[PDB]
Amino acid sequence: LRANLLVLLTVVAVVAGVALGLGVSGAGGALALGPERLSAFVFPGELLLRLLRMIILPLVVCSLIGGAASLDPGALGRLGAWALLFFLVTTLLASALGVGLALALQPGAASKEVLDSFLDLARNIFPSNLVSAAFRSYSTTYEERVKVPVGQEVEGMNILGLVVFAIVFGVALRKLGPEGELLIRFFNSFNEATMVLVSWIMWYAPVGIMFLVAGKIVEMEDVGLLFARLGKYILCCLLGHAIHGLLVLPLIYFLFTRKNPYRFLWGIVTPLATAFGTSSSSATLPLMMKCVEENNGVAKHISRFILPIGATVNMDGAALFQCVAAVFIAQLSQQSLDFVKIITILVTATASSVGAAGIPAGGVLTLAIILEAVNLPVDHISLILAVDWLVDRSCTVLNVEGDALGAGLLQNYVD
Numbered sequence: 001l002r003a004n005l006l007v008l009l010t011v012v013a014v015v016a017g018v019a020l021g022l023g024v025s026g027a028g029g030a031l032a033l034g035p036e037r038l039s040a041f042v043f044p045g046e047l048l049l050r051l052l053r054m055i056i057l058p059l060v061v062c063s064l065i066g067g068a069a070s071l072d073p074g075a076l077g078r079l080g081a082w083a084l085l086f087f088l089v090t091t092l093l094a095s096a097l098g099v100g101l102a103l104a105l106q107p108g109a110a111s112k113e114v115l116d117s118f119l120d121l122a123r124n125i126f127p128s129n130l131v132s133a134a135f136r137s138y139s140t141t142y143e144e145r146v147k148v149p150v151g152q153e154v155e156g157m158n159i160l161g162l163v164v165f166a167i168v169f170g171v172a173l174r175k176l177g178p179e180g181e182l183l184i185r186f187f188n189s190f191n192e193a194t195m196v197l198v199s200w201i202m203w204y205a206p207v208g209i210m211f212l213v214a215g216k217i218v219e220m221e222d223v224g225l226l227f228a229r230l231g232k233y234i235l236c237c238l239l240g241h242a243i244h245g246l247l248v249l250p251l252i253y254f255l256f257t258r259k260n261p262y263r264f265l266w267g268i269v270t271p272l273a274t275a276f277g278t279s280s281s282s283a284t285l286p287l288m289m290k291c292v293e294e295n296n297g298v299a300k301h302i303s304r305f306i307l308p309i310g311a312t313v314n315m316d317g318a319a320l321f322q323c324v325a326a327v328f329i330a331q332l333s334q335q336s337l338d339f340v341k342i343i344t345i346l347v348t349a350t351a352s353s354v355g356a357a358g359i360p361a362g363g364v365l366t367l368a369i370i371l372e373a374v375n376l377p378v379d380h381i382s383l384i385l386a387v388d389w390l391v392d393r394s395c396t397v398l399n400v401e402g403d404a405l406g407a408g409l410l411q412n413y414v415d
């Protein structure tokens, strides 16, 4: 089956990239290649990242506009409220699990204010300019006059603000009635034409993933020794992801929906494999919607409203990764964590996951926020960036999975 062959190649691309990067790192690696050859060697991964980032804006905007315009305003409100509750609860559970695992295994045994960060999140939720929000996000810095906070739009897509605007605009189109049907059709057609482009990009995805992983483990120095140093951190992250995706989320699905959760997960295994490969939830969004609608029988209006929102707001993997990283860095620096600091870590990780952009390496940009909020040093992030390519991929799975089951849950609530 060609459809399964594509995903098999996408997954095997990670293994092939690991092998290629280990082979290149041996026999000199970066020093033997030199910057001129290093850039060319790593370029295909960068090209894949560029394509994935390009598709996100139209894909998310059109999908959300259509999904919101496809539901009654009251039904949409109830569904969105329950979906937000599910996302928040699952993210909090992931954060708590990560903190507990980090405190039990102790992987470390071997600046912006928090209020300003939350106000920046609120500002990004309501973009000041729709065109600017497509490639910029509000961010607060300080002038020492007393540190007075002054904000500006820095680079980085404001995907959360565009998501909110898309939902509101879809609701407005629904309320318009016959007059909004033309725009609903326009945005559905744009969404489908974007699904076509995503499907085409998925064919380049294997080569891009291979070269991305190979470059990211060639850039790593002393791969064996660095893995020996970060083994416990990697174990904590992957074990937390496994527990959350295989025990916690299916347990919630079973409790709220007596149907077997693992059959639902098998129904989307292919989207999960694509998410592990590309490490981007948005690239899996088309295939995930297809699988939940076709394999799991989730209604079209539930799926195409929930999954696009969850791909940006619901990131359980990101929250677990950030909590584990925070506790690991605190242990490295020998700072004890109390209930106040643990709760701060949990809340800040939830907010950061909500603010994350859902792109490869998109979860490390906001870990510094947690480290600053807990008064932990920010330099240690240098270590985490080395392992990201692996951990991030795991996160993506637990991210996209968190969406799918949620839809499967909410649909069952509708019935």
Ligand SMILES: NC(=O)CC[C@H](N)C(=O)O
Residues within 6 Å of the ligand: 279, 280, 281, 282, 315, 317, 318, 319, 321, 356, 357, 358, 359, 360, 361, 362, 363, 364, 392, 395, 396, 399, 400
């Ligand atoms: N570490 C993370 O979860 C970042 C986001 C993740 N790469 C995704 O797109 O789902």
